[PDB]
């Protein structure tokens, strides 16, 4: 899997002339194959085009937030690489503000309901400070590029 | 990600004074996130001290076998470096002969050991148009953790949930 990532972005390099470190590999979703798949699919179809997480999970001091024009390399709820993306906007957003605008960009009165349900969980396992009031850190990117081995047990 | 592995390694040949090259580096499982942080969590906490893979793949993907002695970094369910460990024992056996012993050491009784893996490997072998078999042979590690990836504790940007 390393080497198709190293791969990948190689030739993503290549492919547009340009030297690079290889930006962050992950997929979206709660952590699960399938949220990993779904919505790795939504993604490579365009059908979304954004993502957010949680702001306060971020070390102030010890990294910055993502910033526009930033890559990431998206992987299958079987990590996979999928496609990297480029960003091209972040906004912070409390939970209980999202405009549907956005919402409609990653996703509808369920958004928050399921949302809280999702974030109320990431922050468990820390000191999971909930509120409604919660920021997220609202990435708007689109897709420049896409992807076209053993098992230990 | 890719400096996160090579990082995480060149600190570990520097701690002992070692020059080897980069070894493989991969998660447990199949590649879901969920098995790859449970059984990642059993090799650090000394638990799970065995893993086994199909000696079939290896013939078809026509690659060498683990060494006796060898060094694997280990990534956790969201590809992030969890540790590296070392081979002190490789064995290639039947799978219908595994004895309760390995089992244990794998991570509880060998029938339900049995139908896990059956799948398992059901599943790995299929992309390759090779129906399981009761009795494929297996190949199996046996290793000791050699070191935890603690660089994790100095960025924190080490697993965020993207929605």
Same mark, same amino acid.
């Given at each position: 899997?390393?080497?198709?990532?190293?791969?990948?972005?190689?030739?993503?390099?290549?492919?547009?002339?340009?030297?690079?470190?290889?930006?962050?590999?992950?997929?979206?979703?709660?952590?699960?194959?399938?949220?990993?798949?779904?919505?790795?699919?939504?993604?490579?179809?365009?059908?979304?085009?954004?993502?957010?997480?949680?702001?306060?999970?971020?070390?102030?001091? =010890? /990294?910055?937030? @993502?910033?526009?024009? !930033?890559?990431?390399?998206?992987?299958?709820?079987?990590? +996979?690489?999928?496609?990297?993306?480029?960003?091209?906007?972040?906004?912070?957003?409390?939970?209980?503000?999202?405009?549907?605008?956005?919402?409609?960009?990653?996703?509808?009165?369920?958004?928050?309901?399921?949302?809280?349900?999702?974030?109320? =969980? /990431?922050?468990? @396992?820390?000191?999971? !400070?909930?509120?409604?009031?919660?920021?997220?850190?609202? +990435?708007?990117?689109?897709?420049?590029?896409?992807?076209?081995?053993?098992?230990?047990?």
């Amino acid at each position: 899997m390393l080497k198709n990532v190293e791969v990948f972005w190689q030739n993503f390099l290549d492919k547009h002339e340009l030297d690079m470190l290889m930006p962050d590999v992950w997929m979206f979703g709660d952590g699960s194959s399938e949220m990993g798949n779904r919505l790795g699919q939504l993604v490579v179809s365009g059908r979304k085009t954004a993502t957010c997480s949680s702001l306060d999970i971020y070390k102030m001091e =010890e /990294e910055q937030l @993502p910033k526009a024009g !930033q890559y990431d390399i998206i992987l299958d709820g079987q990590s +996979q690489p999928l496609a990297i993306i480029r960003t091209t906007k972040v906004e912070i957003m409390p939970m209980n503000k999202v405009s549907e605008s956005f919402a409609q960009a990653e996703g509808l009165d369920y958004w928050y309901e399921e949302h809280a349900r999702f974030f109320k =969980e /990431e922050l468990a @396992p820390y000191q999971l !400070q909930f509120y409604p009031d919660m920021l997220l850190v609202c +990435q708007s990117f689109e897709v420049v590029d896409l992807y076209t081995h053993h098992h230990h047990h």
